[PDB]
Design an enzyme around this catalytic site. Structure first.
Site, short mmCIF file in Angstrom:
data_model
loop_
_atom_site.label_atom_id
_atom_site.label_comp_id
_atom_site.label_asym_id
_atom_site.label_seq_id
_atom_site.Cartn_x
_atom_site.Cartn_y
_atom_site.Cartn_z
N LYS A 1 0.84 -1.04 -0.11
CA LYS A 1 -0.18 0.01 -0.04
C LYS A 1 0.83 1.29 0.08
O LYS A 1 1.95 1.24 0.18
CB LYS A 1 -1.06 0.16 1.17
CG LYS A 1 -0.29 0.19 2.35
CD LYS A 1 -0.88 -0.26 3.77
CE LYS A 1 -0.51 0.60 4.87
NZ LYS A 1 -0.76 0.20 6.26
N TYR B 1 16.37 32.44 0.53
CA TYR B 1 15.53 33.35 1.18
C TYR B 1 15.87 33.92 2.57
O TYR B 1 16.21 33.06 3.39
CB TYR B 1 14.06 32.88 1.18
CG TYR B 1 13.48 32.59 -0.36
CD1 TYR B 1 13.03 33.71 -1.20
CD2 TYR B 1 13.34 31.35 -1.02
CE1 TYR B 1 12.56 33.46 -2.42
CE2 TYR B 1 12.97 31.25 -2.32
CZ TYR B 1 12.52 32.09 -3.01
OH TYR B 1 12.05 32.23 -4.27
#
Ligand SMILES: Cc1ncc(COP(=O)(O)O)c(C=O)c1O
Ligand SMILES: Cc1ncc(COP(=O)(O)O)c(C=O)c1O
Ligand SMILES: [Cl-]
Ligand SMILES: [Cl-]
Lengths: 386, 386
Positions: free
Chosen positions: B39, B272
């Site tokens: 899964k 940044y």
């Protein structure tokens, strides 16, 4: 209405995207165009439908992260110009000229070898190029006015290349201290004044991101690059405070309750590690979403959801596919009720910016890490599709 | 060799997977089968190629999180039994029977409505069913022996349903205190025996997970469900201590350098916020991976990568698609060098357990949040394919 085997989904409201585009058009000068940024699956919202809408309502060009992301757009029928913002290997020069994708470059030897590749194959197409100038970001780009001119000289001697832009990036335009933003601008302007005092004509010029378009519309030059503002999110709390432009959020995330039971028999432990034990009149509800979807495990025993307009707490640890919430003593609820994870319900709201604060990051990360195994539905003029 | 436009990728070693299944097969009882859990896109490794390969070297059934994940396996060619572990909506009862997916179920009323839907339709498709018994997890399943008797009769009356299993789940079997795990086992063994006193014959019994099978091999009964151990990683540091089974990790993550420069000109700010300033001698290299790929933003100014057999650090904030790393004063590096983000290079390693420890989470979450936009390559017998 909505029918699913596993009951969890995303709703993205295009009427909101359209209003964000109008708010930005009226605030900037009329000569300046708008380039819509949809890299990274459209900041998590889905790139195909959002690029389509944006081009119908104000944007002229698009920006992405890589050649591959632009190819998904051309395969859906989009003919607009598309600029790659990262570095592209010479492996893909032929492929980019054939799908007509624009690339950024800033090196004399890259320029030279790109030209050779398309020469030695004849090629009717000319590869478009944008030059990136580094004035303070330190990421990519050319750094001095003398070596920018070698690159301009070289790009001009290349018959199979086409110069269609020149740009730079602001590294702190969302902070109160405007010192460095004023300095980068000064540097960028003197480099084009340098190039102009030699008979060189300049193509399209752009520098502004979302925050610098809002605080300094006088920098709009020929074009801006609208990113997080398009999805209705503010780059910082300081830019939200100057109350200059009104944005609306586009995205909500929902699901339906899977099972309900009253914790009457023993043991009454809940989830891995047994970090939460229930009361014998406590009601416990199970939802189909987990950390593999992008719901951080760090919200174990911490975060909330909205059921019937109430905030309700996560009980125990988050697992890979499911979470558990508490309804209280003799709580109220049914298998199949609707729950809101990010968004607004009745009179309540849990905002993306709240979840981001709770986890010590910015809203960019929250939305753009939502997995692709979750289906996205689109609302335009108050109705559903996809 | 490996040719990409954006130069980042994953490698899955399938000779590791085969050895990990050999080890497990040779620990549990010879009369027990293995169900392989794939899964969440094979825990981030890719579900199709790992299932194909595990069915050929020791497993006989498979488990997924939803019908949709199961159908992708049938479309790839696989005819093995496939069990869905979560809750499936009644509106997919007809699709499941058509594709022959085994469904989990635990309510009397779900059973009858699922039978009536297949009665008004014919089609020799009987829908197979496993019953979930809750003994302490608190997530899904039935919780009293009187309720379990009602559901077993409602199912045995239903002419189009077919009963093929019954299981439970342990919530604390990876911890050194075995108190709660033995309690759960006593509860399950008693419920089963109350069904025998009534004249009921039993199908397949399964209860163990990776930690349960290493630690209590005599709980194997008919079948076990092998998940995290398939991919070469341990459930907990404690279960690594016991030193009972040897596993080999199957995944690594790599990129190539995009640009290198010296910070001679001014200003010397990086990324940044300008949270990092460089020496006039420092060398800065740029890399194509960011937080939208699943490389956590909390690694700003903290993380490491391997370049030429040595750790070098992240400099500045992580951005959506790129990171910067410092090569130091002096320098030494070129455009196009290979960097390892997780895994090995020469005699150096940055393991996935190490990064999950640094971020206060578990290895389960580091692997399965890796974006589908990174390409996956498979090694089998020393050679590469896709
Ligand atoms: C070079 C560049 N230009 C433009 C943008 C648009 O970003 P924003 O969301 O800040 O408007 C980004 C991000 C970027 O990295
Ligand atoms: C019910 C169940 N069984 C087995 C597994 C595989 O788990 P693990 O990776 O710990 O072996 C999982 C996950 C699960 O939820
Ligand atoms: Cl840049
Ligand atoms: Cl369960």
């Amino acid at each position: 209405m909505i029918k699913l085997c596993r009951e969890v989904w995303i709703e993205v409201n295009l009427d909101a995207v359209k209003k964000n585009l109008r708010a930005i058009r009226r605030h900037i000068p009329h000569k300046s165009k708008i380039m819509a940024v949809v890299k990274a699956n459209g900041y998590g919202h889905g790139s195909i439908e959002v690029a389509r809408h944006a081009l119908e309502h104000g944007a002229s060009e698009l920006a992405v992260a890589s050649v591959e992301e632009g190819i998904v757009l051309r395969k859906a029928g989009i003919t607009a110009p598309i600029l790659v913002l990262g570095f592209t290997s010479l492996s893909c020069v032929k492929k980019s000229a054939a799908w007509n994708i624009t690339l950024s470059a800033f090196q004399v030897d890259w320029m030279k070898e790109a030209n050779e590749i398309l020469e030695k194959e004849a090629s009717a197409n000319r590869l478009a190029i944008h030059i990136n100038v580094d004035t303070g970001m330190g990421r990519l780009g050319v750094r001095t006015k003398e070596e920018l001119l070698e690159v301009v000289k070289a790009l001009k001697a290349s018959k199979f290349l086409r110069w269609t832009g020149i740009f730079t990036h602001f590294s702190t335009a969302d902070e109160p201290d405007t010192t460095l933003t004023k300095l980068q601008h000064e540097k960028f302007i003197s480099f084009l004044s340098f190039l102009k005092k030699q008979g060189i004509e300049l193509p399209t010029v752009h520098m502004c991101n979302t925050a610098a378009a809002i605080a300094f519309p006088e920098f709009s030059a020929d074009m801006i690059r609208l990113g997080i503002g398009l999805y209705g999110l503010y780059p910082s709390a300081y830019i939200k405070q100057l109350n200059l432009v009104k944005l609306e959020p586009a995205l909500s995330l929902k699901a339906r309750i899977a099972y309900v039971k009253t914790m009457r028999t023993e043991p009454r432990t809940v989830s891995y590690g047994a970090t939460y034990i229930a009361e014998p009149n406590e009601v416990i509800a199970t939802l189909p979403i987990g950390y593999a979807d992008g719901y951080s495990r760090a919200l174990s025993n911490r975060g909330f959801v909205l059921h019937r307009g109430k905030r309700v707490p996560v009980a125990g640890r988050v697992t890979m596919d499911m979470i558990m919430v508490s309804l209280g003593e003799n709580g109220e609820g049914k298998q199949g009720d609707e729950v809101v994870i990010y968004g607004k319900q009745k009179g309540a709201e849990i905002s993306v910016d709240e979840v981001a604060e709770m986890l010590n990051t910015i809203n960019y990360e929250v939305v753009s890490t939502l997995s692709r195994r979750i289906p996205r539905f689109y609302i335009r003029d108050g109705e559903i599709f996809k």
